[PDB]
Design a protein around this ligand. Structure first.
Ligand code: CHL
Ligand code: CHL
Ligand code: CLA
Ligand code: CLA
Ligand code: CLA
Ligand code: CLA
Ligand code: CLA
Ligand code: CLA
Ligand code: CLA
Ligand SMILES: CC1=C[C@H](O)CC(C)(C)[C@H]1/C=C/C(C)=C/C=C/C(C)=C/C=C/C=C(C)/C=C/C=C(C)/C=C/C1=C(C)C[C@H](O)CC1(C)C
Lengths: 204, 221, 205, 81, 222
């Protein structure tokens, strides 16, 4: 039917053919129970989108810092720099603003098509019909995610794949700076210099 | 009905006729190789439970052919019985006396080079260094027992459970039910002997010290 | 199907019937009784035989060409403990990564024949092979030979390959054990054996 | 202490008493002794998983008497030798 | 039909399975209805078991909670002390609270009396605590037919056990956890005497070197 993670195999029954990025990769059957599949697809959507943003703040800064256009600190040292606010205050402000946005999304997931109206002004509405893809003039200012179902799967598939790669990259940076005690981009430009003696094994 | 055959204080599962000594270990309601986590996907459709020690573990699908299944069962029984004797023969020497001061050896895996060099085999503390005078005798004696076992089945006795008067002199198998459970007991103790043997081989290969001294080091320290 | 046997005066095992290449009814232990296990075993035989062909070549030809010729490889037994472009404990991982792909494709072929006959990148470069253990295509049989339509010449060539391969397996096992014991290379040991066939043997250690 | 003579004596005494009680060589809950020291069977009313009829009370009694006898032997062997 | 631990012919006559934790374990025949009396009778022993078990659940999860929370480091370390050093036994250890432990004991006796006497009066005379005026909330403390399970708007405010099957299973779970907590508190006491350190310290000592840190090695007291 479709190219799966393994060339010779049979896709799990629950992952029939529908969701974007569907490749029948579920060895552990972590979405076999009915109803859990909807939760997981939303969960992966959230992580990947966060990871995309998190990778652009871990590599692009260091990308245009090592060559030098910004002079920003490293990703793993930005947690101590003094900013106009306080680190603790910034944490709490995030927590409440995150609470509002996360809570609005949670209500959408639990009851689809119930949080589609602006509270302050009950005239502005959010254009969205698929859970996890809410449009409107804020999230979708260009109308690039509405129309034929065919293009929806393409762009959605493009979205998740870049996201899956992004999640993997950020996991690297985390562990991969933890043991090497050096920046990610520095590792890249040290791996293309002497590739055969700059490997995971030679870092213990 | 015969010598220590009415001796019904060894059953293992039955205070009374409430069980018939074969209800468990056989049939559909029997213990399986993953306890209550054996939702049927790996329990095949040929391991119904007619044979002793059937726990429904055929991951690699070796016994899917009924003829091969019988051969494997016999082969399991034979390494099983020999393993039982071997582990007993590897431990009892080192529960009676110890230390390799004379040409004696308390270590199971160092008793075989004992004759080869220095002295000869000195039972508990039959000499010289002649290999091919035990070898021939053992080869001759085993070849004929080996040969007399693969053949000479009296008329209809199981070639692996003869149960006559020379192999079942004590008559434990007079009652069919007590033969059914004793077979389970035999195979299960045999499997334990085999795992113990693999432990001795692996532990000797790694640690290189006598198995009981390994236990003493592990427990005491 | 009467045919030459490993042991002339024996009844061939029932499961073997001579159809497989190199089948001489040599199953004294009755290991390949189950048909599926027999299939797995023939694949294992083919892979070991080819790897042993390569190993025998790389063990003897350089060592045949050191006592003469030009190539002075000091030994194959101490060849591992040397220096190269890359270190050993990471060359191993590089090899494992490079081989995982091909070994997985072959595994999938064994479990599901035909599913791994297409090039993943370009869906046109097929392999054109319906017999397991012999893909063909253009990476494995580039120079035409490998197929004969509907005939038995291919079976003869298959038997030739199997037999050369079993010889190579035995030779490489001999290389390993005889290097371990004789503490010396294979080719000079051959020369010494030729010098004194009688006294120079497996007993004059 | 595991290989000590005291440990060996105590283990042997307890094991021997448990064996005697379990295999009908000593009085138990279901094994009454008459005036002639012959063992007759009685219904103590205690259900046990032991096929022979060894109960938890039988186990406790046999262990207690085995410990008593083992302590006696240990102290006697210490005082004498 | 059920698991039997050490049942007997006598015990199984009156232990049939109605009670949640009923497994026939009555080697002493303490719940025989033939000789029911004051406190040794079928109506009181299950209730006493439930109450001892509930207080033991609070005890086992309370005698070790401050020590665990101080080990993970979120309560002050001076409040992260073994249970016996919290003023319950002043000789082994004492702590200075807002009131001396005898004033605290008098306050505890007053409050627990107001609660416990009402519980008793509902046990002896069911429904008698929902009639007389009690600060206007006597209607919440009415209880049900079973003294051990009032299940009112206060004692059951998340409303578990809507159906009878889940209710009974939850009863069995409560009884099992209570028996476990009772045995755990007995272990706390004996280990406090024999070791001199808190239960979590004993657990960590056993987890560190199990073969040299156990009852056999540690009946040297100190
Ligand atoms: C069948 C199982 C079997 C196993 C597990 C071993 C195991 C061993 N034998 Mg042994 N033997 C076995 C059969 C026999 N051995 C011998 C005679 C010897 C000798 C003379 C020697 C061994 C030695 C050994 C060791 C290395 C081989 C190892 C401990 C060697 C050894 O002792 O290593 C320290 C050694 O010198 N074996 C005979 C002929 C009587 C056997 C007949 O079946
Ligand atoms: C080489 C010197 C040698 C000597 C002095 C002895 C001496 C003895 N053997 Mg021994 N044996 C010797 C070699 C061997 N024995 C045996 C197998 C036996 C057996 C089965 C028995 C003896 C017995 C005996 C004793 C009679 C006697 C102590 C008997 C005791 C006895 O039953 N030997 C084999 C095989 C040998 C190979 O060399
Ligand atoms: C937390 C992130 C996350 C989540 C929730 C999911 C969830 C999902 N993925 Mg996605 N995926 C992810 C990360 C994630 N994935 C990453 C990083 C990759 C690249 C390696 C992929 C690659 C991928 C493919 C190729 C496919 C999926 C599919 C699926 C679905 C079935 C599997 C499932 O139930 O997952 C449940 C997962 C969890 C409960 C997470 C457990 C994580 C463990 C506990 C720790 C892992 C540690 C790690 C090794 C470091 C489900 C919607 C399949 C599908 O059809 O979806 C439409 C499919 O074809 N995913
Ligand atoms: C987008 C994925 C990605 C990419 C391109 C790289 C690229 C690189 N990594 Mg990183 N890494 C990643 C994911 C990635 N990694 C993840 C997910 C982990 C966590 C398991 C790590 C953990 C890690 C460590 C601990 C180290 C590297 C190192 C390296 C460099 C050499 C490769 C090597 O030896 O490690 C390859 C390691 C892997 C686990 C392979 C994962 C690749 C798949 C596609 C994911 C190279 C710059 C080494 C370095 O700094 O050298 C300069 C080094 O010491 N990486
Ligand atoms: C995201 C999860 C995931 C995971 C864990 C795997 C894991 C695996 N894949 Mg799959 N695969 C995935 C996603 C995934 N793939 C996706 C998204 C595609 C595209 C549809 C494929 C397409 C694919 C093909 C076509 C094949 C594999 C194969 C393999 C195996 C060997 C790869 C290897 O070691 O290369 C090591 C070398 C690297 C450079 C890495 C390995 C078990 C191969 C295999 O062995 O199949 C049996 C194989 O033939 N995969
Ligand atoms: C193709 C197989 C092959 C061949 C041609 C040789 C050839 C030789 N070996 Mg090696 N060897 C082999 C396999 C082989 N070996 C294997 C499998 C082992 C492991 C058991 C050994 C272990 C070994 C040791 C330990 C020693 C030799 C030695 C020798 C030499 C003297 C002969 C001898 O002692 O035979 C001994 C042979 C055996 C013990 C096993 C029999 C060999 C195979 C199984 C049977 C023959 C197969 C086939 C019919 C031969 C066709 C040959 C054809 C091309 C003419 C000679 C150069 C000795 C040496 O270095 O002398 C200078 C020596 O010390 N070999
Ligand atoms: C001296 C030997 C001896 C001793 C002390 C005991 C002691 C005990 N056995 Mg018995 N038992 C023995 C030999 C012995 N058994 C033998 C030889 C068998 C046959 C294999 C059994 C089969 C057996 C069964 C099937 C059960 C016991 C049970 C019990 C325990 C009763 C509670 C008690 C500790 C019961 C048990 O564990 O209950 C807790 C139980 O169910 N035993
Ligand atoms: C290996 C076996 C063994 C050995 C060598 C001993 C040896 C001894 N026992 Mg021990 N004992 C044993 C088994 C053994 N006992 C067993 C199986 C039991 C049963 C549990 C006891 C119970 C026992 C008790 C209760 C006592 C001894 C005492 C003694 C000592 C006797 C001195 C005495 O008062 O006698 C002379 C006694 C008389 C002549 C009778 C006095 C008259 C009335 C009773 C007063 C002596 C060291 C005694 C002891 O330790 O004293 C120092 C003591 O009190 N034994
Ligand atoms: C909830 C039951 C429970 C649990 C989990 C433990 C656990 C432990 N006890 Mg405590 N103990 C208990 C009850 C319990 N005990 C009771 C009732 C008593 C009074 C008889 C004691 C008296 C006691 C002493 C005096 C000592 C321990 C010690 C220990 C440690 C094990 C080493 C040892 O010698 O054990 C000995 C264990 C016993 C003497 C009691 C065995 C019988 C009881 C009923 C426990 C049965 C456990 C059972 C499997 C249920 C576990 C529930 C759950 C974890 C699965 C370990 C932290 C030792 C320690 O602190 O090491 C540093 C130590 O010196 N315990
Ligand atoms: C079941 C199954 C199922 C699924 O399907 C899969 C799986 C899981 C894989 C599987 C598994 C398997 C296994 C585990 C097996 C094992 C085996 C063994 C261990 C054997 C032994 C076996 C063992 C044996 C025989 C033993 C023997 C012994 C002997 C001879 C001995 C000898 C001796 C001695 C005495 C000592 C002295 O001084 C000397 C000598 C001479 C040294």
């Amino acid at each position: 039917d479709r190219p799966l993670w393994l060339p010779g195999s049979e896709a799990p029954k629950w992952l029939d053919g529908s969701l974007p990025g569907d490749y029948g990769f579920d060895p552990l059957d972590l979405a076999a129970e009915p109803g859990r599949l909807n939760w997981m697809v939303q969960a992966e959507l959230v992580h990947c989108r966060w990871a995309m943003l998190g990778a652009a703040g871990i590599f692009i800064p260091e990308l245009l810092t090592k060559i030098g256009i910004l002079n920003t600190p490293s990703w793993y040292k930005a947690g101590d720099a003094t900013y106009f606010a306080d680190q603790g205050t910034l944490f709490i402000v995030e927590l409440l603003l995150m609470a509002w946005a996360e809570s609005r999304r949670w209500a959408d997931i639990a009851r689809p098509g119930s949080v589609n109206t602006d509270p302050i002004f009950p005239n502005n509405k959010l254009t969205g019909t698929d859970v996890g893809y809410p449009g409107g003039l804020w999230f979708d200012p260009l109308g690039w995610g509405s129309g034929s179902e065919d293009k929806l799967k393409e762009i959605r598939t493009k979205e998740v794949k870049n996201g899956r790669l992004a999640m993997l990259a950020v996991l690297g940076a985390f562990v991969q700076a933890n043991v090497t005690h050096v920046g990610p981009i520095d590792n890249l430009f040290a791996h293309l210099a002497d590739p055969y003696h700059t490997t995971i094994l030679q870092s213990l | 009905m015969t010598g220590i055959a009415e001796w019904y204080k060894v059953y293992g599962k039955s205070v009374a006729p409430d069980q018939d000594a074969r209800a468990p270990y056989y049939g559909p309601n029997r213990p399986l190789w993953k306890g209550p986590f054996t939702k049927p996907k790996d329990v095949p459709e040929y391991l119904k439970g007619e044979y002793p020690g059937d726990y429904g573990c055929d991951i690699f699908k070796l016994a899917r052919l009924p003829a091969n299944y019988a051969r494997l069962r016999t082969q399991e029984l034979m390494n099983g019985r020999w393993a039982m004797l071997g582990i007993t023969g590897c431990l009892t020497p080192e529960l009676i006396n110890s230390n390799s001061t004379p040409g004696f050896e308390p270590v199971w895996f160092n008793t075989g080079a004992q004759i080869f060099s220095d002295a000869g085999i000195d039972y508990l503390g039959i000499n010289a260094h002649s290999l091919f005078a035990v070898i021939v005798v053992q080869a001759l004696l085993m070849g004929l027992a080996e040969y007399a076992r693969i053949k000479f089945v009296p008329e209809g006795a199981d070639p692996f459970y003869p149960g006559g008067k020379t192999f079942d002199p004590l008559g434990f198998s007079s009652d069919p039910e007590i033969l059914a459970e004793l077979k389970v007991k035999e195979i299960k103790n045999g499997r334990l002997a085999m795992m113990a043997m693999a432990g001795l081989f692996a532990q000797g290969a790694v640690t290189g010290v006598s198995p009981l001294q390994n236990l003493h080091d592990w427990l005491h320290l | 199907n009467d045919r030459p046997l490993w042991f002339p005066g024996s009844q061939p095992p029932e499961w073997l019937d001579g159809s497989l290449p190199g089948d001489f009814g040599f199953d004294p232990l009755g290991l390949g009784s189950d048909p599926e296990l027999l299939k797995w075993f023939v694949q294992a035989e083919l892979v070991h035989c080819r790897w042993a062909m390569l190993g025998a070549a790389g063990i003897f030809i350089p060592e045949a060409l050191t006592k003469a010729g030009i190539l002075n490889t000091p030994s194959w037994t101490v060849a591992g403990d040397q220096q190269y472009f890359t270190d050993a404990t990471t060359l191993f991982v590089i090899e494992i990564i490079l081989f995982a792909w091909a070994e997985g494709r072959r595994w999938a072929d064994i479990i599901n024949p035909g599913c791994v006959n297409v090039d993943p990148v370009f869906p046109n470069n097929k392999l054109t092979g319906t017999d397991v253990g012999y893909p063909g295509g253009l990476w494995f049989d580039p120079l035409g030979w490998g197929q004969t339509g509907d005939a038995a010449k291919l079976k003869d060539l298959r038997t030739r390959e199997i037999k050369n391969g079993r010889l190579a397996m035995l030779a490489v096992l001999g290389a390993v054990v005889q290097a371990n014991y004789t503490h010396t290379g294979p080719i000079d040991n051959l020369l010494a054996h030729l010098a004194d066939p009688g006294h120079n043997t497996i007993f004059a250690l | 202490y595991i290989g000590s003579s005291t440990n060996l004596i105590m283990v042997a005494s307890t094991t021997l008493m448990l064996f005697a009680g379990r295999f009908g060589l000593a009085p138990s809950a279901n094994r009454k002794s008459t005036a002639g020291l012959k063992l007759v069977d009685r219904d103590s009313g205690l259900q046990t998983g032991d096929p022979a009829g060894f109960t938890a009370t039988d186990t406790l009694a046999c262990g207690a008497l085995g410990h008593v006898i083992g302590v006696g032997i240990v102290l006697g062997l210490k005082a004498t030798a | 039909k059920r698991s039997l631990i050490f049942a007997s012919k006598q015990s199984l006559s009156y232990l049939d399975g109605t009670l949640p934790g009923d497994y026939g374990f009555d080697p002493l025949g303490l719940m025989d209805p033939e000789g029911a009396g004051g406190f040794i009778d079928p109506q009181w022993l299950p209730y006493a078991e439930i109450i001892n078990g509930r207080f033991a659940m609070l005890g086992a999860a309370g005698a070790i909670a401050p020590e665990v929370l101080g080990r993970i480091g979120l309560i002050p370390q001076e409040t992260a002390i073994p249970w016996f050093q919290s003023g319950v036994i002043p000789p082994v250890g004492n702590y200075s609270y807002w009131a001396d432990p005898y004033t605290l004991f008098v306050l505890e006796m007053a409050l627990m009396g107001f609660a416990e006497h009402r519980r008793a009066q509902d046990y002896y005379k069911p429904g008698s605590m929902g009639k007389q005026y009690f600060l206007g909330l006597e209607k919440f403390l009415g209880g049900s037919g079973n003294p051990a399970y009032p299940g009112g708007p206060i004692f059951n405010f998340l409303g578990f056990g809507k159906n009878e099957k889940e209710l009974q299973e939850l009863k069995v779970k409560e009884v099992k956890n209570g028996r476990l907590a009772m045995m755990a508190v007995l272990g706390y006491f004996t280990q406090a005497i024999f070791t001199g350190v808190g239960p979590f310290q004993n657990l960590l000592d056993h987890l560190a070197d199990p073969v040299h840190n156990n009852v056999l090695t540690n009946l040297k007291i100190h």
